[PDB]
């Protein structure tokens, strides 16, 4: 899309990006909570840093989910620019509609950005949101992204889980 993204920022600069997994030497420890009625997702192709899925979905083939990704950025990386370009990805979604570009936030004591809204996929309105947390540590900038997605009618399920995540997550570099 026409919006500059974090991926564009990485591509256009002398920045190395490497995926991070639980237990990797040199990486932060991120304790995400598992809200009630949600179940933990292990690390997989579809949940690179794990995630959570709602255990009482209206459509078991399309349940509300919050998936985590953790990346390690080294080189000519400015943590403030990661936050600056965080809204680009969602804003490029087909028919995305949200309240502006989102807002600043914090998670586990680190600076973050969150935006949410709706988009249309296969003729169905979906609620989507992304929280990006910048974690400068150990000669690198780690970037955590939490990607929430659900059918429009299950928007409140996502919002409830988000409050639990916002209040209980700890991040220790």
Ligand X SMILES: CCCCCCCCCCCCOC[C@H]1O[C@H](O[C@H]2O[C@H](CO)[C@@H](O)[C@H](O)[C@H]2O)[C@H](O)[C@@H](O)[C@@H]1O
Residues engaged in binding ligand X (CB under 6 A): 66, 97-99, 114, 116-118, 127, 129, 131, 146, 148, 155, 158-159, 162, 165
Nearer to ligand X, 87 or 116 (CB): 116
Nearer to ligand X, 129 or 140 (CB): 129
Nearer to ligand X, 84 or 164 (CB): 164
Q: How far is the CB of 77 from ligand X (least distance, A)?
A: 23
- Relative to beta strand 65-75, strand 170-172 is unpaired
Nearer to ligand X, 99 or 122 (CB): 99
Nearer to ligand X, 71 or 114 (CB): 114
Q: How far is the CB of 25 from ligand X (least distance, A)?
A: 27
Token pair of 132 as six digits: 């990006």
Pick from 94, 97, 79: nearest CA to 137: 79
Q: How far is the CB of 26 from ligand X (least distance, A)?
A: 25
* Closest residue to ligand X, based on beta-carbon distance: 116
Q: Where are the beta strands (DSSP E) in the chain?
A: 15-19, 29-31, 38-41, 51-54, 65-75, 97-98, 103-107, 110-121, 124-137, 140-151, 170-172
- Helices assigned H by DSSP within the chain: 6-11, 79-85, 88-91, 155-168
Task: Count Cβ atoms below 10 Å from residue 16 Cβ, excluding itself.
Answer: 12
Q: How far is the CB of 134 from ligand X (least distance, A)?
A: 15
Q: How far is the CB of 128 from ligand X (least distance, A)?
A: 8
């Amino acid at each position: 899309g026409p919006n500059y993204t974090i991926a564009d920022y990485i591509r256009d600069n002398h920045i190395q990006e490497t995926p991070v997994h639980h237990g990797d030497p040199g990486s932060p420890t991120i304790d995400l909570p598992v809200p009630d009625d949600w179940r933990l997702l292990p690390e997989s192709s579809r949940a690179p840093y794990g995630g959570i899925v709602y255990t009482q979905p209206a459509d078991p083939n399309d349940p509300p989910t919050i998936v985590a990704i953790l990346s390690k950025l080294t080189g000519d990386i400015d943590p403030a620019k990661v936050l600056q370009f965080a809204p680009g990805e969602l804003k490029n979604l087909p028919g995305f509609q949200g309240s502006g570009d989102g807002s600043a936030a914090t998670l586990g004591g680190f600076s973050a950005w969150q935006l949410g809204g709706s988009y249309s996929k296969n003729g169905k309105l979906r609620t989507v949101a992304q929280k990006t947390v910048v974690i400068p540590s150990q000669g690198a900038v780690f970037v955590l992204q939490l990607n929430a997605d659900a059918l429009d009618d299950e928007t409140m399920t996502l919002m409830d889980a988000a409050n639990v995540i916002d209040e209980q997550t700890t991040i220790t570099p």
